[PDB]
């Protein structure tokens, strides 16, 4: 059994920031986002501090933060929510771990929505990058998946938006666009339950976790200047 | 009789981890391993038993997982998996030994991709390695071999990011780039069946082992802030 969270940020999140090491891809470490949701639960929502220790401590399994879309200065559209085939794929291989698409490889071109594509280019930032023709419906199809994830509110959010584009200038832009995590940036984890888990207790996990989707919680420094706020939600597979 | 497994790390792994004592090299100890192998047809296959204790105890050997590919962080392609003539050398002798090309020794120089070489160098964290033109075709070999091996989905993976680089900078990177075993690491171990084994007990075997294949475990300490889940692979000889 396992549980779907998203992560999109309202305002600029500081987790020196924590990176994965041979990526360079910024991440939440899955001890920090533990803390902040055992937090919001015994603050927040109320839920009694016996509940708490029996799914927390474990029953459960809380795992590092990714990233999924990032969000880039577009010359059409204002901005855009980029994303690249190792993101993508990395994404689709932990949903596989979760229970639960071909995405090609791009080197010098990309696949955007056309809310965002100007002249067969876009241009995020600087980068002027060519566009493909979306056959075999990408797009529509990552839409799809990010509406069974993290629901309808979030795929609204960002179709008309999309940029799927090489690794390498993600990887660029992730490093080299602002110390804060920007606001409107998509993070994806994994809840998953331990197999020592007892039928009775996915009933307890079931109702406390449900708990945390549609909510806004803090994460990181600076809670004092407005950093860090960002809305959750939680799916079940 | 042998069968092949593979360990593709998911996430931050932690087996002061466990390396191998002359090398250095990061190590799976097949005690180790053969505790989650059980635990796991115990939990979650739902293997009686009775079969589980015919074959862990034994009936087979579970040898200690050594090391195929480590991610590192790449200029171009974002990251590649590198790896050794010893290393490679290695993994030729250990098929033997289970019952199944030439690789050069480099000095300076490295054999990589593509996709990940720049101007006849692969940037590997820091290290400049000049690269050496592929002849005697050794890298899709080694692809082949990895098909093979581990399955058509794990040669997809590594193909286009591999370059086969010195045994001293390999040991460099594998002891000084991160306590954890980073994601996308790829471990390998060979499970021997004893040599007093009937056609009975190679039906047995094959049933319970082939359950492994494509499935995932937690492997080392960490486990309620995922850390240290792994995909692992099986394939016979």
Redesign the interface.
């Known amino acids: 059994k396992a549980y779907l969270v998203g992560l999109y940020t309202l305002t600029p999140t500081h987790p020196p920031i924590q990176r ?5 891809f910024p991440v939440i ?3 920090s986002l ?1 803390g902040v949701l055992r937090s919001y639960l015994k603050l927040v929502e109320k839920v009694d501090e016996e509940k708490i220790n029996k799914i ?3 029953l ?5 933060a990714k990233i999924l879309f990032f969000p880039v200065r577009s010359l059409k559209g204002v901005y855009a929510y980029v994303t690249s085939p ?1 993101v993508l794929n990395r994404f689709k ?2 949903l596989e ?1 979760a229970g639960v698409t071909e995405i090609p ?1 791009l ?1 010098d071109t990309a696949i955007a929505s056309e809310e965002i594509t100007v002249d067969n280019k876009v241009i995020l930032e600087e980068f002027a990058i060519l566009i493909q023709k979306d056959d075999k419906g990408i797009l529509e199809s990552v839409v799809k998946a990010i509406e069974q994830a993290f629901g309808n509110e979030m795929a609204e959010k960002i179709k008309g938006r999309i940029a799927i584009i090489p ?2 200038v993600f ?1 660029d832009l992730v490093e080299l666009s602002t110390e804060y995590i920007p606001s409107d940036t998509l993070f994806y ?2 809840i ?1 339950v ?3 888990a007892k039928d009775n207790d996915m009933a307890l996990i079931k109702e406390v976790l449900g708990k945390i989707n549609g909510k806004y919680l803090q994460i990181g420094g600076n809670e004092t200047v407005g950093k860090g706020f960002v809305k959750v939600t939680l799916k079940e597979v």
């Open positions: 994965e090491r041979h990526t360079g470490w899955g001890q533990k927390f401590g474990g459960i399994s809380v795992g590092d190792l291989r932990d771990l490889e080197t690794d390498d990887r984890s994994l998953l331990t197999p020592r």
